[model samples]
Target chain A: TKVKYPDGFRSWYHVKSMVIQPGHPLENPVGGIHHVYANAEAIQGLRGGNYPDGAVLVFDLFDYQEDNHALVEGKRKLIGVMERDAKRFSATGGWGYEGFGEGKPDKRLVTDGGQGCFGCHAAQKESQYVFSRLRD
Target chain B: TKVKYPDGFRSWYHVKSMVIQPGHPLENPVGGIHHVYANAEAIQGLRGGNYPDGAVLVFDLFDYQEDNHALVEGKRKLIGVMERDAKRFSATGGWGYEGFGEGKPDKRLVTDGGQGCFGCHAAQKESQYVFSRLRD
Candidate 1:
């Protein structure tokens, strides 16, 4: 699998330097929206020269629809994630990627190194395969 | 209090609007913070010249202060709520007024049966004791 579904990840990195931003509905974000919550360990992992194992980043996406030209922020569509565990996920460059729906197993989407997500996130290679930058 | 805190209010009206106007920090509140959320019933009530019973409006306010010479959105000072329930809140001219502390009832303050809140809001008696006008 690319990444394991980060169950109970929110409690893992409870406090932080900042609160993650939620999906804004003003710009007509229709469906498939994401709100990212990464832990303190994940951010500190980046400080260790390069990638840090055990640093799991979670992205929760929801649906946004337009009703009568009025935008409506909808429900959870799916969860996308990136977890770093050097030896455990060495095949995918020490990162496991997966998507879980309704919070269960067998629903993992990114089974391999990267298909839907990795291809998109690869642009942030300089950012160590991560997209959102941690603020100082 | 007859007014009910509109739960999941952000979902009721997804359209984000600036709650305060611009001016000096004391008068203009250049970076001062406020966000308004009103449900459909509140909107309809405002349209008919007076906010009817069962209408709810919430104001999330934060005192923005200059910290270290830079503007910072400081503590959430209050979560003001107004509910129009004519017969139910007959004492305070049929509208319930309550100011909650971060949405917690235990920390609630400024509910002097319109003395603290209602008296000031009474200036807008024409607008059904409301400071907000529906431009939607």
Candidate 2:
């Protein structure tokens, strides 16, 4: 695999988070709250510039249960990652996409050779194929 | 302080999250998005039973910024904790409260001997002085 699991990503730079509630457009596939994290190299591009090789980004997703009028994290859904390796992943704009089922290290979910992920990320070519950004 | 900084808490069991926006009642001191985490011992109590000594709960607070119509985590504001020790904290319902400024282990923020924290949590005497609950 061109990309490895993001070890210790929870301690990285937490960029942002979003909750996709039921009935939302993305609920069917990514129905949960997800936190975005960026490694130091990825932070540079998130701030403003092209990503350098070795940059990595993580999307940590978790199921949510509402109790006491508040949303709480339930079981983890998956851990998605995007790793930049210019020459190694040139076919996909120098990015490698992978998802670990239930955040487990052994369960690799992406099986379409990353084509499906690239298909959507291609739309963000102008932004280095990344849809996330750093705010402040 | 009785409660130590929650080491490696980001990988713990995430209980829930809430965002305190501008104009909200908690905005003055805790304005931002916060994630609640519980250690193994604390989870026992959060699920149902009484918390045993050494049980700990963490409240991680962060500043946020809006960009592209989405809220992202900004700088960390503080890391709050609730540690249970029946004999040591008999006055505060057997819980010790402490806050670490900006998530730094060296910077402690609570100064009122946890009286302020206990004052608010006292309302939840029925729930073991805990306002949070687990769902599903």
Candidate 3:
């Protein structure tokens, strides 16, 4: 089945990259890193089909440094990125739609223009500091 | 201890917002109403002083909901407000001090600007459909 936006906004959101750190509880002891790539344009219908001009991208990168040791033991970090163009918003990043709109160019929901989503992106400047990415 | 950002770039990053819904599993089960806000900003260290900037904000509102015969839940929503501001780059509407001199803002090590820190804030949106006092 295909996943759509909360309010059927005819748009989608996508995650470009997400990486988890090693040696961290969610990594070392747990085995590997955690990664996720979600499309912002895919969400619609939660707010009556009128898509908000900008959509917030939510995600987590956890670190288990001292104390506790359960699933919630690790410290969770949140990062938000802004989408650039509203004209170029769709599930298929502007590529022509194929099966499941696979090859189509994704026209997704975007955030307000000029917002520095990269500041959060650049936070982990050391060790590829990004906490969300697929481990090889 | 004090926190600092890299370079001299102190700017505000726009963060996303979310709304909460009743009967959600993440609800607090008490009064199911909450609000949250978040933002990312930068900090810098210059001269003999360390200034914190380029930090993110995650604020919220909370509430409660009732489900079934004996199920009560707490809810939270995002207010979509600025979380933190760079002391140097921020003129107003940011947390922390604003100065480049002897009385400069104190630098405290806080993970409030890290990734995943806003999940709880984002969850708050689930309580009130993303509507919060900050929005009003």
Candidate 4:
């Protein structure tokens, strides 16, 4: 089954933003300015330690430009998402991962059953495969 | 009459972020990395162009550090707020502006009865004295 697009996730709780600049180790496929957002359920998990079913997290990425020395967002790059369902996605620690290219609801970007994505996330097992922390 | 502290505004809608560096015209007093947030009511106005009473918008500012070419948030500078109340703040376009120094609830920064803030915001009269546009 496919992970549905996270509609209207931009209105969710913003966790934080990270600018992955060029020359960074994670620049090849994920270089950009990305904002992390978590739904209400995920916020509880972020504050605590374990995400519950129905929790969702969105990584909104965008191309950026330097205008008068200030970085501003350009067109969107893509949105990476994670949906949690303990029974449905038990293979990847109860989370299903997917990416919507350019944030289009119909544009699905993941093709490898999330094995490639899970490989890196598995290192973050302690944090439930989430790299972002809520900015107090 | 003071604008009450916006408790837990980080959980609100993340509108957008702006980075202002040195040498910019608005640098002396407002230079920093700031994220804009809007309450649910303000989000409606942001999308439809008319804010309602009780709408709140927050400009969460922070000093930033360049770490390995990526700009990261440092200590918070202040949290500038605009709360809407038609009768309460009629002189300032129905919005009361205040600045809480270093995110502290007790440290109010505006001293001119919001006149200084209204002066600049008044220019945005067509947009209800709000300069931010919600990021889609």
Best by DockQ: 4
Candidates in descending TM-score order: 4, 2, 1, 3
For model 1, residues A1-136, the per-residue Cα lDDT tens digits are: 3465676653333111111123323222213334455666675754544666778887655554534322233655566678888787665556677778744556765545565455666677677777655421
Model 4 lDDT tens row, A62-87: 88887886777888999999998888
lDDT of 1 at B99: 74
User: What stretches of model 4 exceed 4 Å from their correct place?
Assistant: none
Over B36-84, each residue of candidate 1 has an lDDT whose tens digit, in order, gives: 5566678776667456567778776655553332223466666777787
Interface RMSD of 3: 16.3
Model 1 chain B poorest 10 in a row by lDDT: B13-22
Residue-wise C-alpha lDDT for candidate 4, range B22-91, written one tens digit per residue: 8777786678788999988898899976699889999998887767767677788899999999889987
As for lDDT, the candidate ahead, 3 or 4, is 4
CAPRI quality of model 2: incorrect
lDDT of 3 by residue, B16-125 (tens): 22223344454332122222222222212111122244443333333323232111223332222332444532323223321111112333223344223234334543
Which candidate do you rate higher for TM-score, 3 or 4? 4
Q: Is the docking of candidate 4 incorrect, acceptable, medium or high quality?
A: medium
Model no. 1, DockQ: 0.04
Best-matching candidate per lDDT:
4
Provide the clashing-pair count of each candidate structure: 7, 0, 104, 0
Predicted structure 2: lDDT: 0.82
